[PDB]
């Protein structure tokens, strides 16, 4: 595993250890085996400024929040497996650098205001709604299963919940992390790139972005 492509800084800022690094796990994505998560976490500990923040970032009713629901159904059991692998793979010195951020650790009141902005935009702006939905339709068109329009719309809202964490630097239990690692560029990361630059839906940048954009580090074998 090494850095492939970087959006938001130069290669020199990474080998200089300027930033804390988040490991965004897409639970249910076949690449995020425990072995690959361990390799992302290993790489992150070696390149980080200080901390590695592990969190659930995607999931393509016991809670009003899909990301919360995911957290309590599956995110906890995943965190339990990662913890045990880590305590056998790393020294007590390294384990102290790891923060297991739950959805509620990240989605504080400031975060929820951003999400709420997006939800309202999804409901009142039909171009924005239509665009978010097509991300969903693209994904589902590479899966076998079909989905109705009502579920497409629901899946779109799930994206908006995670959007601020990809766009802005947020704190996880009082620890700012400026960059996150992910094994592949996606349509989401290209979308976020445009949002941060105000080249698409510029109202979003005006209302939720703070001139400290999340840095995306593409890291894989």
XYZ file of N, CA and C in Angstrom:
663
model
N 0.813 -1.207 0.000
C 0.000 0.000 0.000
C 0.852 1.264 0.000
N 0.587 2.164 -0.946
C 1.200 3.485 -0.936
C 0.244 4.463 -1.602
N 0.486 5.746 -1.337
C -0.265 6.838 -1.937
C -0.252 6.744 -3.455
N -1.443 6.768 -4.047
C -1.575 6.855 -5.494
C -1.825 8.298 -5.903
N -3.040 8.790 -5.673
C -3.430 10.128 -6.093
C -3.940 10.926 -4.900
N -3.726 12.240 -4.968
C -3.978 13.167 -3.871
C -4.822 14.320 -4.397
N -5.944 14.586 -3.735
C -6.753 15.763 -4.009
C -6.730 16.640 -2.765
N -6.216 17.861 -2.912
C -6.195 18.812 -1.819
C -4.826 19.190 -1.275
N -3.746 18.504 -1.653
C -2.393 18.900 -1.235
C -1.371 18.255 -2.172
N -0.087 18.427 -1.854
C 1.003 17.824 -2.608
C 1.564 16.615 -1.870
N 2.315 15.796 -2.609
C 2.928 14.610 -2.020
C 3.862 14.970 -0.869
N 4.436 16.178 -0.886
C 5.383 16.559 0.160
C 4.703 16.741 1.512
N 3.448 17.190 1.525
C 2.761 17.385 2.794
C 2.485 16.071 3.500
N 2.454 14.962 2.764
C 2.126 13.677 3.372
C 3.354 13.060 4.025
N 4.443 12.927 3.266
C 5.677 12.401 3.833
C 6.214 13.292 4.949
N 5.743 14.537 5.033
C 6.039 15.445 6.134
C 5.089 15.275 7.314
N 4.078 14.412 7.193
C 3.200 14.070 8.314
C 2.425 15.289 8.820
N 1.880 16.081 7.891
C 1.200 17.319 8.278
C -0.154 17.071 8.926
N -0.804 15.954 8.623
C -2.211 15.798 8.946
C -2.476 14.519 9.727
N -3.522 14.578 10.549
C -4.174 13.384 11.054
C -4.994 12.754 9.937
N -5.109 11.429 9.978
C -5.632 10.646 8.863
C -6.829 9.828 9.327
N -7.930 9.928 8.587
C -9.097 9.089 8.799
C -9.115 7.910 7.840
N -9.588 6.779 8.337
C -9.767 5.584 7.530
C -11.271 5.414 7.360
N -11.784 5.736 6.172
C -13.224 5.705 5.908
C -13.604 4.315 5.417
N -14.303 3.561 6.246
C -14.653 2.191 5.908
C -16.046 2.162 5.294
N -16.158 1.580 4.104
C -17.455 1.372 3.456
C -17.876 -0.049 3.806
N -18.578 -0.180 4.921
C -19.036 -1.479 5.384
C -19.888 -2.150 4.313
N -19.589 -3.413 4.026
C -20.316 -4.157 3.018
C -19.705 -4.096 1.636
N -18.687 -3.266 1.446
C -17.924 -3.247 0.208
C -16.879 -4.355 0.282
N -16.798 -5.177 -0.764
C -15.990 -6.391 -0.688
C -14.506 -6.101 -0.463
N -14.024 -4.912 -0.826
C -12.614 -4.603 -0.620
C -12.284 -4.440 0.858
N -13.260 -4.031 1.679
C -12.986 -3.731 3.082
C -13.064 -4.993 3.945
N -12.257 -5.972 3.560
C -11.981 -7.088 4.444
C -11.178 -6.599 5.633
N -11.148 -7.417 6.694
C -10.351 -7.080 7.874
C -8.877 -6.935 7.498
N -8.393 -7.787 6.592
C -6.989 -7.718 6.181
C -6.664 -6.384 5.505
N -7.508 -5.941 4.559
C -7.276 -4.643 3.905
C -7.472 -3.468 4.858
N -8.456 -3.550 5.751
C -8.602 -2.494 6.753
C -7.331 -2.394 7.586
N -6.771 -3.541 7.970
C -5.540 -3.530 8.749
C -4.418 -2.870 7.967
N -4.372 -3.105 6.657
C -3.302 -2.524 5.854
C -3.511 -1.029 5.680
N -4.763 -0.588 5.537
C -5.018 0.849 5.545
C -4.638 1.456 6.891
N -4.952 0.765 7.983
C -4.629 1.318 9.291
C -3.120 1.329 9.507
N -2.425 0.284 9.055
C -0.967 0.271 9.170
C -0.358 1.463 8.437
N -0.721 1.639 7.159
C -0.211 2.753 6.365
C -0.514 4.086 7.032
N -1.713 4.223 7.606
C -2.107 5.491 8.208
C -1.287 5.799 9.457
N -1.022 4.788 10.285
C -0.199 5.009 11.468
C 1.201 5.467 11.082
N 1.728 4.956 9.966
C 3.080 5.302 9.539
C 3.161 6.700 8.933
N 2.064 7.230 8.395
C 2.109 8.527 7.732
C 1.426 9.642 8.510
N 0.792 9.339 9.640
C -0.063 10.341 10.255
C 0.752 11.343 11.053
N 0.145 12.514 11.262
C 0.740 13.515 12.141
C 0.701 13.057 13.588
N -0.364 12.361 13.981
C -0.477 11.877 15.349
C -1.511 10.766 15.478
N -2.719 10.982 14.956
C -3.827 10.071 15.190
C -4.329 9.453 13.895
N -4.925 8.272 14.043
C -5.663 7.585 12.989
C -7.093 7.405 13.501
N -8.061 7.935 12.760
C -9.469 7.948 13.152
C -10.199 6.959 12.258
N -10.693 5.876 12.846
C -11.383 4.827 12.108
C -12.878 5.084 12.212
N -13.565 5.123 11.071
C -15.002 5.336 11.108
C -15.672 4.653 9.927
N -16.982 4.487 10.069
C -17.841 3.949 9.028
C -18.319 5.109 8.174
N -18.091 5.018 6.868
C -18.343 6.140 5.984
C -19.419 5.897 4.944
N -19.961 4.689 4.846
C -20.893 4.401 3.764
C -21.465 3.012 4.000
N -22.562 2.705 3.303
C -23.224 1.415 3.485
C -24.048 0.868 2.323
N -23.929 1.484 1.147
C -24.696 1.086 -0.033
C -25.273 -0.329 -0.038
N -37.352 0.122 11.582
C -36.190 1.005 11.601
C -35.913 1.393 13.047
N -34.677 1.199 13.511
C -34.378 1.417 14.919
C -33.858 2.815 15.212
N -33.804 3.679 14.208
C -33.266 5.017 14.370
C -33.811 5.859 13.232
N -33.868 7.169 13.453
C -34.252 8.059 12.368
C -33.108 8.316 11.395
N -31.885 7.915 11.735
C -30.705 8.147 10.908
C -30.180 6.824 10.360
N -30.078 6.720 9.032
C -29.547 5.498 8.437
C -28.133 5.221 8.927
N -27.279 6.254 8.955
C -25.909 6.047 9.420
C -25.878 5.617 10.880
N -26.778 6.144 11.709
C -26.880 5.630 13.073
C -27.332 4.175 13.079
N -28.353 3.841 12.278
C -28.824 2.460 12.219
C -27.677 1.510 11.863
N -26.933 1.834 10.795
C -25.753 1.061 10.399
C -24.789 0.923 11.571
N -24.507 2.039 12.255
C -23.584 2.023 13.388
C -23.979 0.982 14.427
N -25.264 0.906 14.775
C -25.655 0.023 15.866
C -25.933 -1.407 15.420
N -26.252 -1.628 14.150
C -26.461 -2.992 13.677
C -25.135 -3.682 13.390
N -24.245 -3.002 12.705
C -23.048 -3.620 12.152
C -21.764 -2.909 12.552
N -21.783 -1.573 12.621
C -20.572 -0.820 12.901
C -19.913 -1.209 14.207
N -20.709 -1.582 15.209
C -20.123 -1.976 16.483
C -19.386 -3.310 16.369
N -20.006 -4.314 15.738
C -19.344 -5.613 15.603
C -18.093 -5.512 14.738
N -18.116 -4.649 13.728
C -16.906 -4.407 12.955
C -15.810 -3.820 13.840
N -16.144 -2.768 14.598
C -15.173 -2.145 15.495
C -14.604 -3.152 16.479
N -15.408 -4.128 16.905
C -14.894 -5.155 17.808
C -13.857 -6.032 17.113
N -14.098 -6.388 15.846
C -13.134 -7.222 15.132
C -11.852 -6.449 14.857
N -11.981 -5.191 14.432
C -10.801 -4.379 14.148
C -9.946 -4.239 15.395
N -10.583 -3.910 16.529
C -9.862 -3.762 17.793
C -9.020 -4.994 18.101
N -9.623 -6.180 18.005
C -8.888 -7.384 18.365
C -7.744 -7.645 17.390
N -7.995 -7.530 16.084
C -6.895 -7.643 15.125
C -5.789 -6.654 15.459
N -6.160 -5.415 15.795
C -5.168 -4.378 16.065
C -4.342 -4.714 17.301
N -4.988 -5.202 18.365
C -4.235 -5.497 19.579
C -3.305 -6.692 19.419
N -3.477 -7.497 18.368
C -2.507 -8.540 18.051
C -1.483 -8.101 17.012
N -1.763 -7.036 16.255
C -0.919 -6.612 15.142
C 0.014 -5.454 15.478
N -0.291 -4.669 16.508
C 0.426 -3.430 16.773
C 0.813 -3.353 18.241
N 1.819 -2.534 18.522
C 2.257 -2.335 19.893
C 1.252 -1.465 20.640
N 1.301 -1.544 21.975
C 0.538 -0.617 22.804
C 0.819 0.829 22.422
N 2.040 1.109 21.965
C 2.396 2.455 21.536
C 1.546 2.889 20.343
N 1.420 2.015 19.346
C 0.634 2.359 18.171
C -0.859 2.365 18.484
N -1.343 1.377 19.250
C -2.773 1.296 19.529
C -3.291 2.571 20.179
N -2.443 3.263 20.933
C -2.863 4.502 21.566
C -3.176 5.593 20.551
N -2.668 5.472 19.319
C -2.893 6.460 18.267
C -4.224 6.278 17.538
N -4.983 5.240 17.855
C -6.153 4.868 17.073
C -7.397 5.318 17.822
N -8.321 5.939 17.101
C -9.590 6.406 17.645
C -10.700 5.769 16.825
N -11.564 5.004 17.487
C -12.697 4.364 16.823
C -13.886 5.309 16.908
N -14.115 6.073 15.844
C -15.144 7.108 15.846
C -16.462 6.500 15.384
N -17.448 6.473 16.279
C -18.806 6.104 15.899
C -19.491 7.260 15.193
N -20.590 6.933 14.517
C -21.388 7.968 13.881
C -21.728 9.097 14.853
N -22.073 8.762 16.100
C -22.453 9.823 17.035
C -21.248 10.652 17.497
N -20.038 10.072 17.515
C -18.831 10.862 17.774
C -18.590 11.942 16.717
N -19.013 11.710 15.478
C -18.761 12.648 14.379
C -19.945 13.583 14.163
N -21.164 13.054 14.241
C -22.369 13.826 13.958
C -22.819 14.596 15.203
N -22.057 15.638 15.533
C -22.443 16.525 16.623
C -23.465 17.549 16.119
N -23.729 18.573 16.925
C -24.758 19.527 16.529
C -24.337 20.323 15.298
N -23.075 20.758 15.241
C -22.606 21.480 14.062
C -22.746 20.622 12.803
N -22.329 19.354 12.883
C -22.463 18.448 11.745
C -23.917 18.329 11.313
N -24.826 18.126 12.273
C -26.232 17.931 11.922
C -26.829 19.161 11.249
N -26.335 20.353 11.572
C -26.819 21.538 10.871
C -26.440 21.487 9.400
N -25.226 21.030 9.091
C -24.862 20.858 7.689
C -25.789 19.851 7.010
N -25.956 18.666 7.605
C -26.860 17.655 7.043
C -28.249 18.242 6.813
N -28.765 18.971 7.807
C -30.092 19.564 7.694
C -30.174 20.544 6.524
N -29.108 21.320 6.294
C -29.065 22.181 5.115
C -29.273 21.358 3.853
N -28.548 20.242 3.751
C -28.588 19.405 2.555
C -29.957 18.775 2.373
N -30.542 18.255 3.464
C -31.873 17.647 3.405
C -32.896 18.635 2.863
N -32.861 19.864 3.377
C -33.768 20.903 2.895
C -33.504 21.208 1.426
N -32.229 21.252 1.032
C -31.896 21.462 -0.378
C -32.432 20.321 -1.246
N -32.259 19.072 -0.790
C -32.815 17.902 -1.485
C -34.313 18.020 -1.717
N -35.026 18.663 -0.792
C -36.482 18.756 -0.879
C -36.972 19.958 -1.665
N -36.212 21.053 -1.706
C -36.702 22.269 -2.352
C -36.070 22.556 -3.706
N -34.929 21.943 -4.012
C -34.202 22.143 -5.259
C -34.318 20.861 -6.079
N -35.028 20.929 -7.202
C -35.295 19.709 -7.960
C -34.081 19.299 -8.796
N -33.264 20.257 -9.243
C -32.022 19.895 -9.920
C -31.074 19.169 -8.973
N -30.977 19.639 -7.731
C -30.128 18.973 -6.749
C -30.635 17.565 -6.438
N -31.925 17.439 -6.136
C -32.532 16.123 -5.944
C -32.235 15.190 -7.117
N -32.530 15.644 -8.333
C -32.341 14.799 -9.505
C -30.897 14.363 -9.657
N -29.948 15.238 -9.298
C -28.542 14.889 -9.457
C -28.106 13.871 -8.408
N -28.530 14.057 -7.159
C -28.159 13.106 -6.118
C -28.743 11.728 -6.431
N -29.957 11.694 -6.968
C -30.586 10.414 -7.266
C -29.812 9.633 -8.318
N -29.180 10.330 -9.263
C -28.526 9.625 -10.355
C -27.249 8.943 -9.896
N -26.610 9.456 -8.841
C -25.553 8.685 -8.200
C -26.076 7.327 -7.788
N -27.266 7.318 -7.191
C -27.862 6.069 -6.738
C -28.180 5.181 -7.932
N -28.837 5.747 -8.949
C -29.214 4.956 -10.119
C -27.994 4.366 -10.820
N -26.869 5.084 -10.811
C -25.633 4.544 -11.369
C -25.171 3.307 -10.604
N -25.125 3.395 -9.272
C -24.745 2.241 -8.464
C -25.670 1.064 -8.719
N -26.976 1.276 -8.545
C -27.910 0.168 -8.648
C -27.889 -0.448 -10.040
N -27.442 0.300 -11.050
C -27.350 -0.252 -12.394
C -26.149 -1.170 -12.575
N -25.259 -1.262 -11.586
C -24.198 -2.262 -11.594
C -24.461 -3.409 -10.619
N -25.532 -3.335 -9.836
C -26.011 -4.449 -9.033
C -27.116 -5.187 -9.784
N -27.368 -6.431 -9.365
C -28.450 -7.205 -9.971
C -29.815 -6.696 -9.519
N -29.944 -6.329 -8.244
C -31.245 -6.017 -7.666
C -31.820 -4.724 -8.240
N -33.147 -4.689 -8.372
C -33.855 -3.482 -8.775
C -34.335 -2.709 -7.547
N -34.657 -1.434 -7.759
C -35.149 -0.578 -6.685
C -36.204 0.373 -7.228
N -37.236 0.641 -6.426
C -38.264 1.557 -6.896
C -37.818 3.006 -6.689
N -38.568 3.929 -7.301
C -38.193 5.338 -7.237
C -38.216 5.860 -5.809
N -39.156 5.370 -4.988
C -39.210 5.796 -3.595
C -37.949 5.381 -2.842
N -37.425 4.183 -3.116
C -36.193 3.742 -2.464
C -34.978 4.474 -3.018
N -34.960 4.759 -4.323
C -33.878 5.574 -4.865
C -33.810 6.887 -4.107
N -34.967 7.546 -3.966
C -35.012 8.813 -3.251
C -34.500 8.667 -1.829
N -34.934 7.613 -1.123
C -34.433 7.369 0.233
C -32.928 7.156 0.248
N -32.414 6.336 -0.671
C -30.977 6.099 -0.711
C -30.222 7.404 -0.926
N -30.798 8.322 -1.708
C -30.157 9.609 -1.924
C -29.963 10.375 -0.632
N -30.991 10.407 0.223
C -30.841 11.067 1.523
C -29.719 10.452 2.351
N -29.514 9.140 2.242
C -28.423 8.517 2.983
C -27.080 9.097 2.551
N -26.942 9.415 1.266
C -25.704 10.027 0.795
C -25.497 11.385 1.450
N -26.556 12.187 1.555
C -26.378 13.545 2.065
C -25.916 13.528 3.508
N -26.324 12.513 4.264
C -25.891 12.383 5.650
C -24.373 12.290 5.753
N -23.744 11.522 4.861
C -22.292 11.368 4.872
C -21.574 12.500 4.154
N -22.270 13.281 3.334
C -21.592 14.265 2.491
C -20.709 15.241 3.272
N -21.171 15.883 4.356
C -20.302 16.872 5.023
C -18.976 16.298 5.495
N -18.985 15.070 6.009
C -17.742 14.449 6.457
C -16.752 14.292 5.307
N -17.243 14.121 4.071
C -16.310 14.026 2.945
C -15.837 15.396 2.484
N -16.628 16.429 2.735
C -16.341 17.754 2.212
C -15.531 18.606 3.170
N -15.819 18.520 4.469
C -15.222 19.429 5.434
C -14.409 18.634 6.454
N -13.431 19.309 7.042
C -12.683 18.735 8.152
C -13.520 18.853 9.421
N -13.838 17.704 10.022
C -14.682 17.605 11.207
C -13.879 16.950 12.319
N -14.358 17.124 13.548
C -13.733 16.524 14.716
C -14.438 15.224 15.074
N -13.651 14.237 15.506
C -14.159 13.010 16.110
C -13.681 12.990 17.554
N -14.618 13.116 18.487
C -14.309 13.276 19.908
C -13.118 14.219 20.093
N -13.332 15.463 19.666
C -12.377 16.533 19.875
C -11.073 16.437 19.115
N -10.989 15.610 18.071
C -9.748 15.425 17.321
C -10.018 15.717 15.852
N -9.524 16.851 15.383
C -9.669 17.201 13.982
C -8.827 16.263 13.131
N -9.400 15.769 12.041
C -8.624 15.015 11.073
C -8.818 15.658 9.713
N -7.699 15.996 9.068
C -7.723 16.796 7.852
C -7.801 15.958 6.591
N -7.404 14.691 6.660
C -7.317 13.838 5.488
C -7.953 12.495 5.783
N -8.433 11.839 4.737
C -8.873 10.466 4.877
C -8.347 9.670 3.696
N -8.202 8.373 3.927
C -7.642 7.458 2.948
C -8.765 6.599 2.404
N -8.641 6.238 1.133
C -9.668 5.443 0.508
C -9.040 4.750 -0.686
N -9.333 3.471 -0.924
C -8.545 2.714 -1.907
C -8.781 3.124 -3.354
N -9.858 3.850 -3.659
C -10.207 4.167 -5.037
C -10.880 5.526 -5.115
N -10.519 6.296 -6.138
C -11.350 7.420 -6.542
C -12.746 6.908 -6.879
N -13.771 7.626 -6.449
C -15.128 7.272 -6.855
C -15.787 8.463 -7.537
N -17.013 8.227 -8.016
C -17.877 9.326 -8.433
C -18.178 10.263 -7.272
N -18.280 9.731 -6.054
C -18.510 10.598 -4.897
C -17.328 11.539 -4.691
N -16.095 11.007 -4.770
C -14.927 11.842 -4.494
C -14.748 12.896 -5.579
N -15.017 12.539 -6.840
C -15.052 13.559 -7.886
C -16.164 14.581 -7.633
N -17.336 14.124 -7.193
C -18.422 15.055 -6.871
C -18.003 16.022 -5.768
N -17.459 15.479 -4.672
C -16.972 16.305 -3.566
C -15.899 17.278 -4.039
N -14.999 16.820 -4.915
C -13.990 17.726 -5.447
C -14.612 18.952 -6.078
N -15.656 18.742 -6.890
C -16.338 19.873 -7.527
C -17.056 20.745 -6.501
N -17.700 20.126 -5.502
C -18.390 20.918 -4.488
C -17.418 21.841 -3.768
N -16.276 21.293 -3.323
C -15.306 22.085 -2.566
C -14.803 23.255 -3.384
N -14.781 23.119 -4.699
C -14.357 24.214 -5.557
C -15.504 25.115 -5.965
N -16.732 24.811 -5.547
C -17.834 25.633 -6.006
C -18.126 25.503 -7.482
N -17.683 24.423 -8.117
C -17.985 24.234 -9.533
C -19.293 23.483 -9.767
N -19.925 22.982 -8.708
C -21.247 22.373 -8.799
C -21.992 22.714 -7.515
N -23.290 22.982 -7.656
C -24.165 23.487 -6.595
C -23.394 24.419 -5.670
N -22.984 25.598 -6.157
C -22.126 26.479 -5.343
C -22.782 26.966 -4.069
N -24.105 26.890 -3.968
C -24.732 27.222 -2.696
C -24.243 26.296 -1.580
N -23.860 25.066 -1.915
C -23.434 24.140 -0.871
C -22.137 24.630 -0.237
N -21.165 25.016 -1.070
C -19.905 25.541 -0.547
C -20.146 26.758 0.342
N -21.032 27.656 -0.093
C -21.293 28.878 0.658
C -21.844 28.573 2.044
N -22.680 27.545 2.150
C -23.457 27.308 3.356
C -22.819 26.316 4.324
N -22.025 25.352 3.860
C -21.487 24.352 4.778
C -19.963 24.264 4.779
N -19.250 24.774 3.778
C -17.799 24.617 3.726
C -17.110 25.820 4.368
N -15.943 25.572 4.980
C -15.315 26.564 5.851
C -13.880 26.902 5.448
N -13.514 26.713 4.178
C -12.156 26.956 3.685
C -11.119 26.051 4.352
N -11.550 24.898 4.870
C -10.659 23.838 5.346
C -11.179 22.521 4.780
N -10.961 22.269 3.494
C -11.595 21.107 2.865
C -10.906 19.794 3.208
N -11.736 18.759 3.304
C -11.230 17.422 3.553
C -10.277 17.015 2.432
N -9.107 16.500 2.829
C -8.088 15.988 1.914
C -8.308 14.500 1.655
N -8.304 14.122 0.379
C -8.569 12.759 -0.052
C -7.260 12.119 -0.505
N -6.907 10.993 0.117
C -5.687 10.239 -0.178
C -6.092 8.878 -0.712
N -5.782 8.628 -1.974
C -6.079 7.347 -2.592
C -4.943 6.379 -2.277
N -5.235 5.344 -1.491
C -4.206 4.427 -1.005
C -4.684 3.002 -1.216
N -3.896 2.207 -1.933
C -4.223 0.810 -2.190
C -2.942 0.066 -2.532
N -3.081 -1.234 -2.773
C -1.962 -2.043 -3.245
C -1.653 -1.772 -4.719
